[PDB]
Write a protein that binds this DNA or RNA. Structure first.
Lengths: 227, 227, 227
DNA sequence: CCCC
DNA sequence: CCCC
DNA sequence: CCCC
C-alpha cells in the first residue's frame, strides 16, 4: 500500500508548560514496511498568532495531503480524525450525526463539511483517491505526527536566536535526537513497531538543548533549547 | 496458582490488510512465574471459510480450555472476554444486563449463554473448576494470545508453498522470531513484564518472511511470507 | 516548576493474589528534569488492618503532601485523582456534579469535600499554594507512585523475617532492583520518559526475592520475599 | 475517584 | 463481547 | 474532532 497522511503537531509552550500555538503541519508518503517516510511536505504556522480553539490545522492538513497526493499518487489519503474511516467526500449533516463520536465531534464537522466535502469530492472525481478520517488507528498518521514533532524541533532550531529561548511541546511519547546534519525523531512506544523519522537541516552553533518529560502531561516530552 | 487459559488469534489478511478469517485457537497452562506456557493445545480453523461476524471463536476457546483442563487439573480457567471476571455458569440475562458492557456485547452474550452457561455449570459440578470471563485483565489469556500468534505464523509456514504468499495479522503488539527449529513469540509491551512463548516446528526452506506494522491498525504487526 | 505530589500504593497480597491492604503513602518533591525525586516523605499503613472499601488513602495523601509542602514551598500540589486539574478548594457538590467523572466518583468526592475542601481552602489562604486534582495526567504523581512501590518493597524487607513470607503487589508496570544499600524503582513504560526512584535502606540477609507478573492483573508486578 |  |  |  502507498498512503499519504497529514497531521498538525508540536506546540510552543510558555514557562507554565501551557500550549501557546501549534507549529508544524506535515504530509507524508508512507510505503512498506510502513515504519517511516522518505517523501514529505511541511507547512509552518505562526504559534504566536494561532487559535487553539479554532481548527485551522485540519484545513491545512487536508490541503497539504492533497498537494502531495497529486504528485505521488497514493492509494488513499489518511486524515487525522477518528471517525471510523469514513470518506470525507461522503460527509454531510446526515452522516455526521450517525457517527458514534461525541456530540461536540458532530458539531465541529458540520462546519468543516462546507469546504472539505466538496473538495474531497472534486479530488476523488479527478484522481479516484479517497480521503478517509481514520485518525488514531492509522500508522501513516502517527508517522506524520512524528514528523510534525521533528519539524517543530527544526522550527525551534531555525528560530531560537531571534527569541532567545523556546519550549517545544512534542507529540505523544516521542523523542528527538540532533546530529550534525539531521534531526531524528522516534516513537517511545515499542508497541508501534519502531516508528521513526529523519529530516536534514543545518544545526546552528552556540545552542544547548534538553529533552525531558512534561510534568503536567504524562507521556509527553518537552524540547528545550537556549543560547 | 495454576491457570488454564484459551484464546483465538491471528488472521489471514488480503493485500489491503483486511482480515479474511481467524487462524489459531490455543489453550495454555500457565504457572509461576507466569511469563510463558510450556503446556498447550492448538486448534486450527479454515481462514478462507471463516465467519468473522460469527462467534465460533469463543466456543472453540471454551472447548479447548476444558479439554486441556481435564488433563492438567488447573485451579481456574480464564476465558478471553472482559466481563469483569464473572463465572460463565452464572450468566443469566439479569447479570448480563447488569454488566458494564455495550448493548451489542449484551446481545451477543445473551445468545452465547444458551450453550455456554450449562456447559460451564456441568464442568464445575464435575471438577469444581470455575470458568471466568476475565479477558484483558488476565496474564494467562495474554500468554494464550501470544501463542495464537505463534501458531498462526506456523500455519503460514506450513501453508505458504501451496498458497505462494500470505499476509498474517498477528495479535496486538507481539513479534515473532524464526530460528532453525522453533518460533519465538514476544510481547512488544515491556509493561506486561516480559511475556513470551515458544513452539518447535520444522521450518521450510526457500522462503522469505518480513515483520512490519499493519498500516491500518496501529500496534498490530503483520507477518508476510513468500516463496 | 517545583511540584509536591502524593500517592498511596503497594499492597499485601494473599496466595490468590487478592489485595489485603495498602502499604505506603509517599509525598515527593519534583523538579526539572522531572524524572525522579531527591526529597520525599513516607507514611506506612497497617495492611492487615486496612479498609480497601474505605478511602483513607487519599486523606493520608493530602495530609502528607501538605506536611512536605510546608517545608519546601513548592509552586503547586498534585493530588492523585483525575478530575481534570480542578483545585480541591473549589470542590463543592455544585462543581462536583458538573465534573465529567463517574456517578460513583461524584458520590465519593461529595463526601470527601466535607473535610478536604475546607482543608484546601485553609492551606491556600496561608501559603497561596493550590492543591489540584490532576491524577493520571501528572508526572510528579507517577513519581510518587513509583516511590510508593519502592517503600512497599522496603516495608516488606523490614517486616519479612517476622512474617516469614510476603507477596507485595506493586503499582502499575514498575520494577524494583535491590542493591547492597538501596532499592531502585523504575517505570516499565518507556513512554513516560524514564521515570525512576531511589531509596537507601539496610538490606536484611538470608532473604530471597523474586519479581514476576500478577497473573490476575496484567501490567502489575508482584514482589515476593522469603527467609 | 482510588487499589492490585 | 471478540478480530485485525 | 484535535492540541500539549
Amino acid at each position: 500500500m502507498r498512503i499519504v497522511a497529514a497531521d498538525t503537531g508540536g506546540a510552543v509552550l510558555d514557562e507554565s508548560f501551557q500550549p501557546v500555538g501549534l507549529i508544524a503541519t506535515v504530509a507524508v508518503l508512507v510505503e512498506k514496511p510502513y515504519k517511516t517516510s522518505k517523501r514529505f511536505l511541511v507547512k509552518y504556522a505562526d504559534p504566536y498568532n494561532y487559535d487553539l480553539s479554532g481548527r485551522q490545522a485540519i484545513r491545512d492538513e487536508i490541503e497539504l495531503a492533497i498537494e502531495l497526493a497529486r504528485e505521488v499518487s497514493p492509494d488513499v489519503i489518511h486524515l487525522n480524525s477518528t471517525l471510523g474511516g469514513i470518506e470525507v467526500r461522503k460527509l454531510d449533516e446526515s452522516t455526521i450525526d450517525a457517527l458514534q463520536i461525541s456530540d461536540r465531534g458532530k458539531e465541529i464537522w458540520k462546519e468543516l463539511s462546507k469546504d472539505l466535502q466538496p473538495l474531497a469530492k472534486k479530488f476523488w472525481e479527478e484522481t479516484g483517491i479517497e480521503i478517509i478520517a481514520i485518525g488514531k488507528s492509522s500508522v501513516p498518521v502517527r508517522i506524520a505526527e512524528i514528523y510534525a514533532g521533528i519539524f517543530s524541533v527544526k522550527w525551534a532550531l531555525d528560530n531560537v536566536k531571534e527569541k532567545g529561548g523556546l519550549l517545544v511541546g512534542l507529540p505523544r511519547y516521542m523523542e528527538v535526537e540532533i546530529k550534525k546534519d539531521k534531526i531524528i525523531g522516534k516513537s517511545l512506544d515499542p508497541r508501534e513497531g519502531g516508528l521513526y523519522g529523519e529530516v536534514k537541516t543545518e544545526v546552528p552553533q552556540g545552542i544547548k538543548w534538553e529533552l525531558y518529560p512534561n510534568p503536567l502531561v504524562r507521556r509527553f516530552m518537552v524540547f528545550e533549547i537556549t543560547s
